[PDB]
């Protein structure tokens, strides 16, 4: 991969480990052990105890029903979009544009008020993140397909 | 009794002195439960105490009973001591001496347990592992035959006195040989490591009479427990008393030595097994035992609870009958001991089955055991002369308070008490009427 630096490192480590002696004190230290125990203690980095502690009671079911309705709407619209894809006929070219316009209108009509409501109630859950990712993926796929269609005409 | 029970009753100073030897610490750690070992390993490299709640959060709530038992056992063994954490909290930290010795045993450091072995070169009269095993087996067979009372086996006077002090055999009159009691039969039926451990515990208990250091003896025994088989060790570096104790071990077969003044001693397999073979008994569903043994000791042990049928030069065919089991029980051997002995000596072929022994045979033996204890007899005095319930209730309450009551029946106003408390009950009854 790289230059002879890899061989130089191999020779260096071979020479270093040629004269090797076991060690006892240098293996572990009290501070390192305490830090590892704290990390492995409940609520630590590797033992994060939150894991949506009260997700069943957070974001009350009134919002949850609206979130489920938005999920169903997004799923249906994206199902129509992916059924249209791939575009093999000129008729489907305008249908995908209409689907994109409908997706944008739905986003502006619902997600923005939904985001405002979440900000007002200050919910830490990233519920909008999944919908935003799905919409961004659909938009990127449509843009890539349009670019390829333009490239094919060049 | 086991090692933990013996160590529980020792003073903190003795326990601390025991922890000064790395071999003792390893044995104590291995004697710990599975959960305790993980806690010891986690706290091995900690220079600061930990909160009690933090330790308690390691184990789940469902298994909190095991956590409590392990914590109590560790506190009793004084492996760790509670530290007054600043702010009113309680910190848990292992004993510094015990932790240091455990790290030395595991990681390394310090001087070796034995002084040296190559200073004197190879042994001129060194033996092999099979020879050492044969010597240990011969010594153990001689000891057990002397317990039986066979004239072919003769041991030292102090060894015979030790058995008398242990209660296995009683000497009714001086000069006459002692007779083995029921406790002797129970000891014989025990497993060889269990017998060795019980004998060592009795020796430790009686060592106070000789004024020998318990800590030194325990450390030497634990060092012998982890000693490699077939490797000699230096006699030098030990006190005069311990060597004498070692000489007693020479009589027990645990340690083999050519001469008393010799500087080399070879620990044997029995000494290694003290810290903790294939079995030679085949059990059949038709109440028949096939034993692959030739020594008279095993034949006698089997004939204690069974009827012998055939003795081929390398085989013993016996039948387990109701009469033989009843006779063995009358001799003082319980069915559980017989089952444990059969399981320990069970042939490796029988180990293939999911149960070591067939359930039917064990159930039949247990039922035969309950035959003797089917009838309950209680000598005593029966009171049935109660005119009124109130008078009966007061006397019954007084008898219960005295703890001499055997049986009570308020429906018929009849009671039965021990003869010893009969005088007290009569005195109480007389006083109640006279003072009325």
Coordinates of C-alpha atoms in Angstrom, one line a residue:
Chain A
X1 CA 0.0 0.0 0.0
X2 CA 2.5 2.6 1.2
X3 CA 6.2 2.9 0.6
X4 CA 8.9 0.9 2.4
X5 CA 7.8 2.6 5.6
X6 CA 5.6 -0.5 6.2
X7 CA 8.7 -2.8 6.0
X8 CA 10.6 -0.3 8.3
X9 CA 7.8 -0.5 10.9
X10 CA 7.8 -4.3 10.6
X11 CA 11.5 -4.4 11.2
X12 CA 11.2 -2.0 14.1
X13 CA 8.5 -4.0 15.9
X14 CA 10.4 -7.2 15.2
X15 CA 13.5 -5.8 16.8
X16 CA 11.5 -4.3 19.7
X17 CA 9.8 -7.6 20.5
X18 CA 12.9 -9.7 20.0
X19 CA 14.1 -8.5 23.4
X20 CA 10.9 -8.7 25.4
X21 CA 10.3 -9.3 29.1
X22 CA 7.0 -9.8 31.0
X23 CA 5.8 -6.9 33.2
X24 CA 3.4 -6.8 36.1
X25 CA 3.1 -3.2 37.4
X26 CA 3.0 -1.5 34.0
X27 CA 0.1 -3.6 32.8
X28 CA -2.6 -1.8 34.8
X29 CA -2.9 1.3 37.0
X30 CA -5.3 2.3 39.7
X31 CA -6.5 5.4 37.8
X32 CA -7.1 3.3 34.6
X33 CA -9.0 0.6 36.5
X34 CA -11.2 3.2 38.3
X35 CA -11.9 4.9 34.9
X36 CA -12.9 1.6 33.4
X37 CA -15.1 0.7 36.3
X38 CA -16.8 4.1 36.1
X39 CA -17.3 3.7 32.4
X40 CA -18.7 0.1 32.9
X41 CA -20.8 1.3 35.9
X42 CA -24.5 1.9 35.2
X43 CA -25.1 5.2 33.5
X44 CA -21.6 5.3 31.9
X45 CA -20.5 5.6 28.3
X46 CA -20.7 1.9 27.6
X47 CA -23.6 1.5 30.1
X48 CA -25.9 4.3 29.0
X49 CA -29.0 3.7 31.1
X50 CA -31.3 6.0 29.4
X51 CA -32.1 4.0 26.2
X52 CA -35.5 5.9 25.9
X53 CA -36.3 5.5 29.6
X54 CA -39.9 6.7 29.4
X55 CA -40.5 6.6 25.6
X56 CA -43.8 4.8 26.3
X57 CA -44.9 7.9 28.3
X58 CA -42.8 10.5 26.6
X59 CA -44.3 12.4 23.6
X60 CA -47.9 11.7 24.7
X61 CA -50.2 9.5 22.6
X62 CA -52.1 12.5 21.2
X63 CA -48.9 13.5 19.4
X64 CA -48.1 9.8 18.7
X65 CA -51.4 9.3 16.8
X66 CA -50.5 12.3 14.6
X67 CA -47.0 10.9 14.1
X68 CA -48.4 7.5 13.0
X69 CA -50.8 9.3 10.6
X70 CA -47.8 11.2 9.1
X71 CA -45.8 8.0 8.9
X72 CA -48.7 6.3 7.0
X73 CA -49.0 9.3 4.6
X74 CA -45.2 9.3 4.0
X75 CA -45.2 5.5 3.4
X76 CA -48.1 5.7 0.9
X77 CA -46.6 8.6 -1.0
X78 CA -43.2 7.0 -1.1
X79 CA -44.8 3.7 -2.2
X80 CA -46.4 5.5 -5.1
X81 CA -43.1 7.1 -5.9
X82 CA -41.2 3.8 -5.9
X83 CA -43.9 2.2 -7.9
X84 CA -43.5 4.9 -10.5
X85 CA -39.7 4.3 -10.4
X86 CA -38.0 3.4 -12.6
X87 CA -39.4 5.9 -15.3
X88 CA -39.4 3.9 -18.6
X89 CA -42.1 6.0 -20.4
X90 CA -42.5 9.7 -20.9
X91 CA -45.9 9.5 -19.1
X92 CA -44.3 8.6 -15.8
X93 CA -41.9 11.6 -16.1
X94 CA -44.6 14.1 -15.2
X95 CA -46.2 11.8 -12.6
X96 CA -42.9 11.7 -10.5
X97 CA -42.8 15.5 -10.6
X98 CA -46.4 15.6 -9.3
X99 CA -45.4 13.2 -6.6
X100 CA -42.4 15.3 -5.6
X101 CA -44.7 18.4 -5.5
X102 CA -47.2 16.5 -3.3
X103 CA -44.4 15.4 -1.0
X104 CA -43.1 19.0 -0.6
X105 CA -46.6 20.3 0.0
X106 CA -47.2 17.6 2.7
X107 CA -43.9 18.4 4.3
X108 CA -44.6 22.1 4.5
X109 CA -48.2 21.5 5.7
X110 CA -47.4 19.0 8.4
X111 CA -43.8 18.6 9.4
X112 CA -43.1 22.3 10.0
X113 CA -46.1 22.7 12.3
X114 CA -45.1 19.4 13.9
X115 CA -41.5 20.6 14.4
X116 CA -42.9 23.8 15.9
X117 CA -45.1 21.9 18.3
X118 CA -42.1 19.7 19.3
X119 CA -39.9 22.7 19.9
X120 CA -42.7 24.3 22.0
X121 CA -43.1 21.1 24.1
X122 CA -39.3 20.5 24.0
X123 CA -39.2 16.8 23.1
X124 CA -35.7 15.3 23.1
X125 CA -36.7 12.5 20.8
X126 CA -35.6 12.8 17.2
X127 CA -38.9 11.7 15.7
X128 CA -38.6 14.1 12.8
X129 CA -35.1 12.7 12.0
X130 CA -36.5 9.5 10.4
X131 CA -39.0 11.4 8.2
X132 CA -36.3 14.0 7.2
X133 CA -34.0 11.1 6.3
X134 CA -36.6 9.4 4.1
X135 CA -37.5 12.7 2.4
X136 CA -33.9 13.6 1.8
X137 CA -33.2 10.1 0.4
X138 CA -36.2 10.3 -2.0
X139 CA -35.2 13.8 -3.1
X140 CA -31.5 12.7 -3.7
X141 CA -32.7 9.7 -5.7
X142 CA -35.0 11.9 -7.8
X143 CA -32.2 14.4 -8.4
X144 CA -29.7 11.7 -9.4
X145 CA -32.2 10.1 -11.8
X146 CA -32.9 13.5 -13.4
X147 CA -29.2 14.2 -13.7
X148 CA -28.7 10.8 -15.4
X149 CA -31.6 11.5 -17.7
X150 CA -29.9 14.9 -18.6
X151 CA -26.6 13.1 -19.1
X152 CA -28.1 10.5 -21.4
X153 CA -29.3 13.3 -23.6
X154 CA -25.7 14.7 -23.9
Chain B
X1 CA -17.1 -29.4 58.8
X2 CA -15.6 -27.6 55.8
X3 CA -12.7 -25.1 55.5
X4 CA -15.0 -22.1 55.6
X5 CA -16.6 -23.1 58.9
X6 CA -13.2 -23.7 60.5
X7 CA -11.9 -20.3 59.3
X8 CA -15.1 -18.5 60.4
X9 CA -14.3 -19.2 64.1
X10 CA -10.7 -17.9 64.0
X11 CA -9.6 -14.6 65.4
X12 CA -8.9 -11.7 63.0
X13 CA -5.2 -11.9 63.9
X14 CA -4.9 -15.5 62.9
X15 CA -6.7 -14.8 59.7
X16 CA -4.4 -11.9 58.9
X17 CA -1.3 -14.1 59.6
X18 CA -2.7 -16.8 57.3
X19 CA -3.0 -14.2 54.5
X20 CA 0.8 -13.6 54.8
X21 CA 1.4 -16.7 52.7
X22 CA 0.5 -16.5 49.0
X23 CA -0.4 -20.2 48.9
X24 CA -3.1 -19.7 51.6
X25 CA -4.6 -16.8 49.8
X26 CA -5.0 -18.8 46.6
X27 CA -6.7 -21.7 48.4
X28 CA -9.1 -19.2 50.2
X29 CA -9.9 -17.6 46.8
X30 CA -10.6 -21.0 45.2
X31 CA -12.8 -21.9 48.2
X32 CA -14.9 -18.8 47.5
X33 CA -18.2 -19.1 45.5
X34 CA -18.3 -18.2 41.8
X35 CA -19.8 -14.7 42.4
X36 CA -17.2 -13.9 45.1
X37 CA -14.3 -14.7 42.8
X38 CA -15.4 -12.2 40.2
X39 CA -15.7 -9.5 42.9
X40 CA -12.2 -10.4 44.2
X41 CA -10.7 -10.2 40.7
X42 CA -12.4 -6.8 39.9
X43 CA -11.2 -5.3 43.2
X44 CA -7.7 -6.8 42.8
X45 CA -6.3 -3.8 41.0
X46 CA -8.1 -1.1 43.1
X47 CA -6.3 1.2 45.4
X48 CA -9.5 3.0 46.6
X49 CA -12.6 1.6 48.3
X50 CA -15.9 1.4 46.4
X51 CA -19.4 2.3 47.7
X52 CA -21.5 -0.5 49.0
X53 CA -24.4 0.4 46.7
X54 CA -22.1 0.4 43.6
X55 CA -21.0 -3.2 44.5
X56 CA -24.6 -4.1 45.1
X57 CA -25.6 -2.8 41.7
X58 CA -23.3 -5.3 39.9
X59 CA -25.7 -8.3 40.5
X60 CA -29.3 -8.2 39.3
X61 CA -32.2 -7.9 41.7
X62 CA -33.4 -11.5 41.2
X63 CA -30.0 -12.9 42.3
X64 CA -29.7 -10.5 45.3
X65 CA -29.7 -13.5 47.6
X66 CA -26.5 -14.9 46.1
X67 CA -24.9 -11.4 46.4
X68 CA -25.9 -11.1 50.0
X69 CA -24.5 -14.6 50.8
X70 CA -21.2 -13.8 49.0
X71 CA -20.9 -10.5 50.8
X72 CA -21.6 -12.1 54.2
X73 CA -19.0 -14.9 53.5
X74 CA -16.4 -12.4 52.4
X75 CA -17.0 -10.3 55.6
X76 CA -16.8 -13.4 57.8
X77 CA -13.5 -14.4 56.1
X78 CA -12.3 -10.8 56.5
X79 CA -11.1 -10.7 52.9
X80 CA -12.3 -7.1 52.7
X81 CA -13.0 -4.5 55.3
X82 CA -15.5 -1.7 55.2
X83 CA -13.8 1.7 54.9
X84 CA -15.3 5.0 56.2
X85 CA -15.7 6.9 52.9
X86 CA -15.8 10.6 53.4
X87 CA -19.2 12.2 53.6
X88 CA -20.9 9.4 55.6
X89 CA -20.6 6.8 52.9
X90 CA -19.1 3.3 53.4
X91 CA -16.3 2.0 51.1
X92 CA -15.3 -1.6 50.4
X93 CA -11.6 -2.4 50.0
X94 CA -9.8 -5.7 50.1
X95 CA -7.3 -6.4 52.8
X96 CA -3.9 -5.0 51.7
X97 CA -1.9 -8.0 52.9
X98 CA -4.3 -10.4 51.3
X99 CA -4.4 -8.4 48.1
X100 CA -0.6 -8.1 48.0
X101 CA -0.1 -11.9 48.5
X102 CA -2.8 -12.7 45.9
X103 CA -1.0 -10.5 43.4
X104 CA 2.3 -12.0 44.2
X105 CA 0.8 -15.5 43.7
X106 CA -0.8 -14.6 40.5
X107 CA 1.4 -11.9 38.8
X108 CA 4.7 -12.8 40.5
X109 CA 7.3 -11.2 42.8
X110 CA 9.1 -11.9 46.0
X111 CA 10.8 -15.1 46.9
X112 CA 9.7 -18.6 45.9
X113 CA 7.7 -20.8 48.2
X114 CA 10.5 -23.4 48.4
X115 CA 14.1 -22.4 49.1
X116 CA 15.8 -24.4 46.4
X117 CA 16.0 -27.9 44.8
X118 CA 19.1 -27.9 42.6
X119 CA 21.6 -27.0 45.4
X120 CA 21.9 -30.7 46.4
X121 CA 21.6 -31.9 42.8
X122 CA 19.5 -34.9 41.7
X123 CA 18.2 -37.3 44.3
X124 CA 20.3 -40.5 44.6
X125 CA 17.2 -42.6 45.6
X126 CA 14.5 -40.7 43.7
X127 CA 11.2 -42.6 43.0
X128 CA 8.6 -42.2 40.3
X129 CA 4.9 -41.1 40.3
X130 CA 3.5 -44.7 40.3
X131 CA 5.8 -45.6 43.2
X132 CA 4.6 -42.6 45.2
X133 CA 1.0 -43.5 44.4
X134 CA 1.5 -47.1 45.5
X135 CA 3.2 -45.9 48.7
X136 CA 0.3 -43.5 49.5
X137 CA -2.2 -46.2 48.8
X138 CA -0.4 -48.7 51.0
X139 CA -0.1 -46.1 53.9
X140 CA -3.8 -45.3 53.6
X141 CA -4.8 -48.9 53.6
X142 CA -2.6 -49.6 56.6
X143 CA -4.2 -46.7 58.5
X144 CA -7.8 -47.8 57.6
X145 CA -7.0 -51.4 58.6
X146 CA -5.7 -50.2 61.9
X147 CA -9.0 -48.4 62.2
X148 CA -10.7 -51.7 61.6
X149 CA -8.5 -53.5 64.0
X150 CA -6.6 -55.9 61.8
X151 CA -3.4 -57.1 63.5
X152 CA -1.5 -56.9 60.2
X153 CA -1.6 -53.1 60.4
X154 CA 0.4 -51.4 63.2
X155 CA 0.8 -47.7 63.5
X156 CA 2.5 -45.3 66.0
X157 CA 1.1 -44.8 69.5
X158 CA 0.4 -41.0 68.9
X159 CA -1.6 -41.8 65.7
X160 CA -3.7 -44.3 67.7
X161 CA -4.3 -41.6 70.4
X162 CA -5.3 -39.1 67.7
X163 CA -8.1 -41.5 66.5
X164 CA -9.2 -41.9 70.1
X165 CA -9.4 -38.1 70.6
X166 CA -11.3 -37.8 67.3
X167 CA -14.0 -40.2 68.7
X168 CA -13.8 -42.7 65.9
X169 CA -12.5 -45.4 68.2
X170 CA -12.9 -45.7 72.0
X171 CA -10.5 -47.4 74.4
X172 CA -12.6 -48.8 77.2
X173 CA -9.6 -50.2 79.1
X174 CA -5.9 -49.6 78.8
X175 CA -3.8 -52.1 76.9
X176 CA -6.8 -53.6 75.1
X177 CA -7.1 -52.4 71.5
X178 CA -9.9 -49.8 70.9
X179 CA -13.1 -50.7 69.2
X180 CA -14.4 -48.7 66.1
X181 CA -17.6 -46.9 66.8
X182 CA -20.4 -45.8 64.4
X183 CA -18.5 -42.6 63.7
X184 CA -15.6 -44.8 62.5
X185 CA -17.9 -46.5 60.1
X186 CA -19.2 -43.2 58.8
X187 CA -15.6 -42.0 58.4
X188 CA -14.8 -45.1 56.5
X189 CA -17.8 -44.6 54.2
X190 CA -16.7 -41.0 53.4
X191 CA -14.7 -40.1 50.3
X192 CA -10.9 -40.1 50.5
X193 CA -10.5 -36.3 50.1
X194 CA -13.2 -35.9 52.7
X195 CA -11.5 -38.3 55.0
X196 CA -8.2 -36.6 54.6
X197 CA -9.8 -33.2 55.2
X198 CA -11.6 -34.4 58.4
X199 CA -8.4 -35.9 59.7
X200 CA -6.4 -32.7 59.0
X201 CA -9.2 -30.7 60.8
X202 CA -9.0 -33.0 63.8
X203 CA -5.2 -32.6 63.8
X204 CA -5.5 -28.8 63.7
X205 CA -8.0 -28.9 66.6
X206 CA -5.7 -31.1 68.7
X207 CA -2.6 -29.1 67.8
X208 CA -3.4 -26.7 70.6
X209 CA -2.5 -29.5 73.1
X210 CA 1.0 -29.7 71.6
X211 CA 1.3 -25.9 71.5
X212 CA 2.1 -25.7 67.7
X213 CA 1.5 -22.7 65.6
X214 CA -1.8 -23.1 63.7
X215 CA -0.8 -20.5 61.1
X216 CA 2.5 -22.2 60.2
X217 CA 0.8 -25.6 59.9
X218 CA -2.0 -24.2 57.7
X219 CA 0.5 -22.4 55.5
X220 CA 2.6 -25.5 55.0
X221 CA -0.4 -27.7 54.3
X222 CA -1.7 -25.2 51.7
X223 CA 1.8 -25.0 50.1
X224 CA 1.8 -28.8 49.9
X225 CA -1.7 -28.7 48.3
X226 CA -0.4 -26.7 45.3
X227 CA 2.9 -28.6 45.2
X228 CA 3.7 -30.2 41.8
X229 CA 3.6 -34.0 41.8
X230 CA 6.9 -35.8 41.4
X231 CA 9.0 -32.8 42.4
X232 CA 11.0 -32.7 45.7
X233 CA 11.3 -29.7 48.0
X234 CA 13.8 -28.5 50.5
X235 CA 13.3 -29.6 54.1
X236 CA 15.5 -26.7 55.3
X237 CA 13.7 -23.4 56.1
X238 CA 11.2 -24.9 58.5
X239 CA 10.9 -24.8 62.3
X240 CA 11.6 -27.8 64.4
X241 CA 8.0 -28.4 65.3
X242 CA 6.7 -28.3 61.7
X243 CA 9.3 -30.9 60.6
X244 CA 7.9 -33.1 63.4
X245 CA 4.4 -32.5 62.0
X246 CA 5.9 -33.4 58.6
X247 CA 7.0 -36.7 60.1
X248 CA 3.4 -37.4 61.0
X249 CA 2.5 -36.7 57.4
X250 CA 5.2 -39.2 56.5
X251 CA 3.1 -41.7 58.5
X252 CA -0.1 -40.6 56.7
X253 CA 1.3 -41.1 53.2
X254 CA 0.8 -37.5 52.2
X255 CA 4.5 -36.9 52.1
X256 CA 7.2 -39.5 51.1
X257 CA 10.7 -39.2 52.5
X258 CA 13.5 -41.8 52.5
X259 CA 14.9 -40.8 56.0
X260 CA 14.0 -38.4 58.8
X261 CA 17.3 -36.6 58.3
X262 CA 16.9 -36.5 54.5
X263 CA 16.6 -33.0 53.0
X264 CA 14.3 -34.0 50.2
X265 CA 10.6 -34.8 50.5
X266 CA 8.2 -35.7 47.7
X267 CA 4.5 -34.6 48.0
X268 CA 2.1 -37.3 46.9
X269 CA -1.1 -37.4 45.0
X270 CA -3.2 -37.6 48.2
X271 CA -1.6 -34.3 49.4
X272 CA -2.6 -32.6 46.2
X273 CA -6.1 -34.1 46.4
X274 CA -6.4 -32.6 49.9
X275 CA -7.2 -29.1 48.4
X276 CA -10.1 -30.6 46.3
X277 CA -10.3 -41.6 41.1
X278 CA -12.2 -43.2 38.2
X279 CA -14.3 -45.6 40.3
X280 CA -14.4 -49.3 40.2
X281 CA -18.0 -50.3 41.1
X282 CA -20.7 -51.4 38.6
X283 CA -24.2 -51.2 39.9
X284 CA -27.0 -53.2 38.2
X285 CA -30.8 -52.9 38.4
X286 CA -31.0 -56.4 39.9
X287 CA -29.3 -55.2 43.2
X288 CA -25.9 -56.6 42.2
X289 CA -22.5 -54.8 42.6
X290 CA -19.5 -55.7 40.4
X291 CA -16.3 -54.2 41.9
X292 CA -12.9 -54.2 40.1
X293 CA -10.9 -54.2 43.3
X294 CA -8.5 -56.6 45.1
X295 CA -7.5 -55.0 48.4
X296 CA -9.2 -56.4 51.5
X297 CA -10.1 -52.8 52.6
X298 CA -12.6 -52.2 49.7
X299 CA -13.9 -55.8 50.0
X300 CA -14.6 -55.2 53.7
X301 CA -16.2 -51.8 53.0
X302 CA -18.5 -53.3 50.4
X303 CA -19.4 -56.3 52.6
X304 CA -20.3 -53.8 55.4
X305 CA -23.6 -52.9 53.5
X306 CA -23.9 -55.9 51.1
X307 CA -23.8 -59.6 50.9
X308 CA -20.8 -61.1 49.1
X309 CA -21.4 -63.8 46.4
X310 CA -18.2 -64.4 44.4
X311 CA -14.6 -63.2 44.6
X312 CA -12.7 -63.6 41.3
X313 CA -9.0 -62.7 41.5
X314 CA -9.7 -59.3 39.9
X315 CA -13.5 -59.0 40.5
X316 CA -16.0 -59.0 43.4
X317 CA -19.7 -59.9 42.8
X318 CA -22.0 -59.0 45.6
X319 CA -25.8 -58.7 46.1
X320 CA -27.6 -55.8 47.9
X321 CA -30.3 -57.4 50.0
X322 CA -32.7 -55.9 52.6
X323 CA -31.1 -57.8 55.4
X324 CA -27.6 -56.5 54.6
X325 CA -28.8 -52.9 54.4
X326 CA -30.7 -53.2 57.7
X327 CA -27.6 -54.7 59.4
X328 CA -25.5 -51.8 58.0
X329 CA -28.0 -49.3 59.3
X330 CA -28.0 -50.9 62.7
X331 CA -24.2 -50.6 62.7
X332 CA -24.7 -46.9 62.4
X333 CA -24.4 -46.2 58.6
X334 CA -27.1 -44.1 57.0
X335 CA -28.5 -44.6 53.5
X336 CA -27.2 -41.3 52.3
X337 CA -23.6 -42.2 53.1
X338 CA -24.0 -45.5 51.3
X339 CA -25.4 -43.8 48.2
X340 CA -22.6 -41.2 48.3
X341 CA -20.0 -44.0 48.6
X342 CA -21.5 -45.9 45.7
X343 CA -21.6 -42.7 43.5
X344 CA -18.0 -41.9 44.3
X345 CA -16.8 -45.4 43.5
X346 CA -19.1 -45.7 40.5
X347 CA -17.4 -47.2 37.4
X348 CA -16.8 -44.8 34.5
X349 CA -19.1 -46.8 32.3
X350 CA -22.1 -45.9 34.5
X351 CA -21.1 -42.3 34.2
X352 CA -22.4 -42.3 30.6
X353 CA -26.0 -42.5 31.9
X354 CA -27.7 -39.2 32.9
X355 CA -28.0 -40.5 36.5
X356 CA -24.9 -41.9 38.2
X357 CA -26.9 -44.6 39.8
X358 CA -30.4 -45.9 38.8
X359 CA -33.2 -44.2 40.7
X360 CA -34.9 -47.5 41.7
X361 CA -31.9 -48.8 43.7
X362 CA -31.4 -45.5 45.6
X363 CA -35.2 -45.2 46.3
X364 CA -35.2 -48.8 47.6
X365 CA -32.2 -48.2 49.8
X366 CA -33.8 -45.0 51.2
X367 CA -37.1 -46.8 51.8
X368 CA -35.2 -49.6 53.6
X369 CA -33.5 -46.9 55.8
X370 CA -36.9 -45.5 56.8
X371 CA -38.1 -49.0 57.9
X372 CA -36.0 -48.8 61.1
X373 CA -37.3 -45.3 62.0
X374 CA -40.9 -46.1 61.1
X375 CA -41.8 -46.5 64.8
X376 CA -41.3 -43.6 67.2
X377 CA -40.8 -44.3 71.0
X378 CA -40.8 -41.6 73.7
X379 CA -40.3 -42.5 77.3
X380 CA -42.2 -40.1 79.6
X381 CA -45.1 -39.4 81.9
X382 CA -48.7 -38.9 80.8
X383 CA -51.1 -36.5 82.6
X384 CA -54.8 -37.2 82.0
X385 CA -56.3 -36.0 85.3
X386 CA -57.5 -32.5 84.3
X387 CA -60.9 -31.6 85.6
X388 CA -61.2 -28.2 83.9
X389 CA -59.8 -26.8 80.6
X390 CA -58.5 -23.7 82.3
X391 CA -56.4 -25.8 84.7
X392 CA -55.1 -27.8 81.8
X393 CA -54.2 -24.7 79.8
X394 CA -52.1 -23.2 82.6
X395 CA -50.2 -26.4 83.2
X396 CA -49.6 -26.9 79.5
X397 CA -48.3 -23.3 79.2
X398 CA -46.0 -23.9 82.1
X399 CA -44.7 -27.1 80.6
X400 CA -44.1 -25.3 77.2
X401 CA -42.3 -22.6 79.1
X402 CA -40.1 -25.2 80.8
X403 CA -39.5 -26.8 77.5
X404 CA -40.1 -30.3 78.8
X405 CA -43.3 -31.0 76.9
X406 CA -43.3 -34.0 74.6
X407 CA -46.9 -34.1 73.3
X408 CA -50.0 -32.0 73.8
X409 CA -53.7 -32.6 73.0
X410 CA -56.2 -29.9 74.1
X411 CA -59.1 -31.8 72.5
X412 CA -58.9 -34.6 75.1
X413 CA -56.9 -32.7 77.8
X414 CA -54.1 -35.2 77.7
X415 CA -50.4 -34.3 77.8
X416 CA -47.1 -36.2 77.8
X417 CA -43.8 -34.7 79.3
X418 CA -40.3 -35.9 79.9
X419 CA -39.6 -37.7 83.2
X420 CA -37.0 -35.1 84.1
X421 CA -39.5 -32.3 84.0
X422 CA -42.2 -34.4 85.8
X423 CA -40.9 -33.3 89.2
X424 CA -41.0 -29.6 88.2
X425 CA -44.5 -29.9 86.7
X426 CA -45.7 -31.7 89.9
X427 CA -44.2 -29.0 92.1
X428 CA -45.8 -26.3 90.0
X429 CA -49.2 -28.0 90.1
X430 CA -49.0 -28.5 93.9
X431 CA -48.2 -24.8 94.4
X432 CA -51.1 -23.6 92.3
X433 CA -53.6 -25.6 94.3
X434 CA -52.0 -24.8 97.7
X435 CA -51.8 -21.1 96.9
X436 CA -55.4 -21.1 95.7

